[model samples]
Target: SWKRCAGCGGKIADRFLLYAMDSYWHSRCLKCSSCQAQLGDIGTSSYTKSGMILCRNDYIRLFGNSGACSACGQSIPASELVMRAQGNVYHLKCFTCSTCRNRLVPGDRFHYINGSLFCEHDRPTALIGGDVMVVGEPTLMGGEFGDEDERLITRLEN
Candidate 1:
């Protein structure tokens, strides 16, 4: 035995019933008034307020903003995580690539080639930034070694 459906004012005889908006309804009838998507399932439910029913997506679209992640090609909701590079957004996990994949963290020793991500060792010499000293010539001060000296040479090896 079931009560009249709030959605259509008809008898609810379906096996799966939905209790929403203070009334009984068929599962298919318990929908968001804005988008007409199902409101609640046996275990999940969306927003219900002010004589209106809304699925999470519709509710957010109605009240907030969303973003598109270029790397993963997915919607980056305001509630989730993301990373940014070169004016493009990415899901946090998408911040990886092998044009020297295992690259550096932000502000680390890394390079960008025509907007492509490249690590220090794999990037071309011409792509090096002005701050990076490619030649073995030392700075104005009495410096023992150069940035390239990190690999070892004169005294550190042999």
Candidate 2:
């Protein structure tokens, strides 16, 4: 006639009931613990011991070992805030500029140059191929001014 819903401990007098974990639950009470989605059946969705009902995503997130943070090389919790960049996941505080070692907050622009991370505000400059491309500029723009044994000089006097 009546049963106590395992999920909420309320009386289940509805026309239908769900039997799970050797307990009776209301149709609406049977839901996933992580995402709060309705757990349709006992098998498709998984349930953990200690009466924790979870969907596939939450199940793996809690149980699966993701990896360590790339910046600090510390263990990363699945539930902690994560920032992803350049195929690496990092803790919110660990992501920073390699040059200055300062914190780079969200919405801040960054550049990965010369295999190192740099904050947009302070990137290293190169004369030849960089901002000026001094080492080896791709284009053939040699400033050597020698017209048939005549000496010429190209100066940037500013």
Candidate 3:
């Protein structure tokens, strides 16, 4: 017995057989409802909703806000949950220390240095733009003639 194609409702007679979304499809008939792209040939994953079948890219594009992963620079689908660091959002794998690449778990002290992340043990201090504050009382050094030439001049003037 031949199965009916989900797409065209035609009886299957081709040498190729494809099954997806719990329905049998002729290879050419398996397509995205949104983009009309051939699903089975391009990717193994597909999504369906409200009686419409969609390829992965189209499904994500339609449903997802398309948040790019801060670490991998990949698109984050709407259905895929993510973690956030301050203003940055990330995939779970990207919530990691920039120096050690260790993932930061819940309750783990982390730092967002500039645009990079840091775990408790791998956090680095700002060396380039750090401001130094001297706390000690100022003491005047005796013979504050300054430079060698200035000291010579001061001694000659004295």
- Top model number, TM-score: 2
Give candidate 1 regions above 4 Å deviation.
41-43, 49-51, 65-81, 84-158
Q: Estimate each model's TM-score.
A: 0.42, 0.47, 0.45
lDDT values for all models? 0.52, 0.56, 0.61
Query: How far does residue 87 in candidate 2 sit from its true spot (Å)?
Result: 0.5
Error of 1 at 12 (Å): 1.8
Flag the better candidate by TM-score, 1 or 3: 3
**Candidate with better lDDT, 1 vs 3:** 3
Candidate 1 local lDDT, 1-158, one digit each (tens): 45787778888766666664456766777777687876554225556555566765555555444677776687766545455555556555555543656724554454444445555565566645333312121111111222321111111110
- Please give, for residues 1-158, the per-residue lDDT of candidate 2 as tens digits: 47787789998777666665566777577776777876644334345534576654565566644556777889875555566665566776676778788866666677655435567766666511133111111111121222222111111111
Q: Which of candidates 2 and 3 is the stronger one according to TM-score?
A: 2
Q: Which regions in candidate 2 have their CA more than 4 angstroms from the true location?
A: 4-61, 126-158
Q: Residue 16 deviation, candidate 2, in Å?
A: 14
lDDT of 3 at 105: 69
- Backbone clashes in model 2, listed as residue pairs: 127-132, 127-133, 127-134, 128-133, 128-134, 128-135, 129-133, 129-134
Indicate which candidate wins on lDDT.
Answer: 3
